[PDB]
């Protein structure tokens, strides 16, 4: 979800 | 003028550059498009080409000065490569965007910056129905590539794309052109993510 | 602002840049693809064009810091030219790969780095049978240009390509997209060679 | 040799380049075109390609010198990158302008400058009717990208495009070629804005 | 209008 | 560990940036090609496009070191801009070559260098007969632009051209490929001129 | 034995960067051409694509050296960027030239320089008749962009373009190819203007 | 004439 | 084989 | 001949 979006994947580095 | 040269020297030839926004040091970028033409429509690939102007503005504490200590100077023009600029990106381009103009910014004593380069963009669009009377609709999102909404707030002054300079003898006719700010969230992560959605409806002239 | 400028200055401007991995300093790079679109298929030449996001993860000990000594900062964004990045290349491209997004990476205090460039690729693909019900299968391998498996280990978190933002109105429908890590040895040589094979089966809408 | 090296060093190496004009220190730029060829027409898009030479003139006080102080040198050529140049831009281009000649200017002791780059321009033009005997008219506006009429005054010496060296075997034939300076005000704003409008009427040979 | 001309928008940023 | 940051600095910070070979100090360059794909044939012009890896090898005294002084380091990878590279050229190209891969070399303590750039070349080739069963033969000579055979001596490594990773589903089937060094003497001049001749015979698949 | 390094230094490091010729310090350029191939003929635009080697030779005082003082060194190769090069331009190109070869020059101890870059050039040319037994004629002028004949004198050593290595299987067969010095006088001005005119006559093979 | 030719115009800039 | 793969070729100069 | 090959022209400037 988030992780498909690059700014969001970058802002949740360990999680994604 | 000697005063200007020493001001551009005072802040561009001082130790660092602005490292970009943080959560504690957030930023608002305001975005606006002027659409000049839909240049190419390709049905064999699903790509469409736009020429437009993209207005961007923001404000940095770090670019402030007192006009009095600089001969009453309130603002100045400078190469955009001289300053920090937002990473606002088309999320669905198919080619690197081409720059069709000088990239020059105005900087103001309150720390505000403004910026309007001309641009050509290729992006994903299925143009089926362009020859028809009802026409066809393309959309492309713009947003920061690395910053959350808590870091770069992204805004528009209006959601009417400026069409006052759209080429009159264009192959394509604009039915509507819209630029609207969209906020979305994620279950994992309470922080906002913001885009400006560029939606143009058009048909063969 | 405050502490951030000091941190960047300490990490980059003290000690040279990372010289890359070695046999005694091995490095794991994590690869992952978000396929956005199949843009063009060319039948006179055997060429296929893809637009995707490529996510890269690695971790450097030399890019570590204690948050406390820097006002509790856990991470920062920086231009990807400020830092060593892996030399991961497509092995069967036909044109220079085109970059579609800003080149900015995030660095965490535990030293890990993440980098998500958007890209257009032309690669070797016989598209024959693309217009049938079964479509056509195509593969491109990605790996280090200069480092063996003893120097860069290459991984994925999943074998499935992210298709959740594939252009819904694309010319070509995706039947499957897989991203699978491949190890092999040559009879001559003791070191393993690692790639990730991007296999897409697709057909005309 | 000798004094020319000295002059160029004195002018450019006592720092700092000219920072452009202001309301208080305004500037006059004289524009002129020599149309060499209409290279290409595209009726599917609405683009027409031109090869012209763009003559630009302006004068700066900071570029002045005493020929008696420099072995009687009254002028010299130098690379345009050594000097400030105006940001006169075509307003409706469709691709980045392409430079066809060396970028070298002449500077004279009174501080006057002349710069003549050859260029290929793509811009917005419907060629429908180029096949007839009446041919077709196309126009492209040129002007400063950032400076208003109060900062750059744009000017011409003649409203007649130089055609004396138009390519005699071009696919296209020139009926008229005109360059005209326009001043306008907008409802909101007190400052004037200026452009030179290049209007070309032409047909197939 | 003013805001579709880059130098005018430059001179009137907040308005534009 | 960290021994490499010193060696790199010790190599790329001594006066000797290598000035190239001389008749007194001649250099041997080894040349080998890996055919990946004949991408395109154009019969209206006479051009063919090839994708290939070009393995270049040479040896400089200026790049020797002792491992025992540098933590037992026998070799390192480095950007090809950090070092001199020979001026080996395709003598019959028709377009600027396109670089497909990163450009990183391995230097070894004996001063030997290896460099394997991937490339797309357009060269002159009459493709008449390509649709027949015998196909057609084309050749491209590679050599130095400025050095004679007394300054750069050109060689091949492996007798046979590497076809093992030629694209299996290419538009064009390779019937044969050869790479041979060649020497000529002109009437005027006693020194030899040397090229490597890449002769490939191919047909439509 | 690397006194070359010493030479390149005090030639290119002590004060002078050569500021170009003048009426007081005039210069002669010798121009010759080697036609390799007529690549493309375009009838819809009037363009023709050529690949030729442009041999250029001049002589500068500021480059002279005593070979006794420098290990009996009579010449060296250096990149064309390290030196001044004349601004010889095609006067009727329609696209920026494309460099096909390395840009390295030879400097000899008497201060003479020779420089032979391989180029692709698109220029204005009506190819009507190319179809016939008689063929068609095209010309293109080369000359300095900023220097008169009192500043750069431009000459040849032969009327004959070198055809000895024209591609034997070209689409186009050369019937004739000639280079000739032309002088134009203008009644305003005592200085002559100079160009070398390249006229090629050719037909389909 | 002179002024139609860029090197001649650069050699005679005030006149042109 | 090995020498068609640049990272292998690079790691194995003598062989390739 | 020599002069249509750049390395040869460059090495024999007076002849070429």
From TrEMBL, chains B, C, D, F, G:
Mg(2+) 3 binds at residues 75, 191. One of its GO terms (molecular function) is extracellular ligand-gated monoatomic ion channel activity. Disulfide bonds join 125-138, 188-189. GO terms for cellular component: membrane. Mg(2+) 5 binds at residues 151, 191. Keywords: Calcium, Metal-binding, Receptor, Signal. Ca(2+) binds at residue 164. Residues 16-203 form the Neurotransmitter-gated ion-channel ligand-binding domain. Mg(2+) 2 binds at residues 75, 151. Mg(2+) 6 binds at residue 185. It comes from the Eukaryota. PANTHER family: NEUROTRANSMITTER GATED ION CHANNEL (PTHR18945). This is Soluble acetylcholine receptor. It comes from Aplysia californica (California sea hare). The gene is LOC100533247.
């Amino acid at each position: 979800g988030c992780c498909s979006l690059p700014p969001c994947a970058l802002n949740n580095p360990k999680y994604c | 003028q000697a005063n200007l040269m020493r001001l551009k020297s005072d802040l561009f030839n001082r130790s660092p550059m602005y490292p970009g926004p943080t959560k504690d040091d957030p930023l608002t970028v305001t975005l606006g498009f002027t659409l000049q033409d839909i240049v190419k429509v390709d049905s064999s690939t699903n790509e469409v080409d736009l020429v437009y102007y993209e207005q961007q503005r923001w404000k940095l504490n770090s670019l402030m000065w007192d006009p009095n200590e600089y001969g009453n100077i309130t603002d100045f023009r400078t190469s955009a490569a001289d300053i920090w600029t937002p990473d606002i990106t088309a999320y669905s381009s198919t080619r690197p965007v081409q720059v069709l103009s000088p990239q020059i910014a105005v900087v103001t004593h309150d720390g505000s910056v403004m910026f309007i380069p001309a641009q050509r963009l290729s992006f994903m669009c299925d143009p089926t129905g362009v020859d028809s009377e009802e026409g066809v609709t393309c959309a492309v999102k713009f947003g920061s590539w690395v910053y959350s909404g808590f870091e770069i707030d992204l805004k528009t002054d209006t959601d009417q794309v400026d069409l006052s300079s759209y080429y009159a003898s264009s192959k394509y006719e604009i039915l509507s052109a819209t630029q609207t700010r969209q906020v979305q969230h994620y279950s994992c992560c309470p922080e906002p993510y913001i885009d400006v959605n560029l939606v143009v409806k058009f048909r063969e002239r």
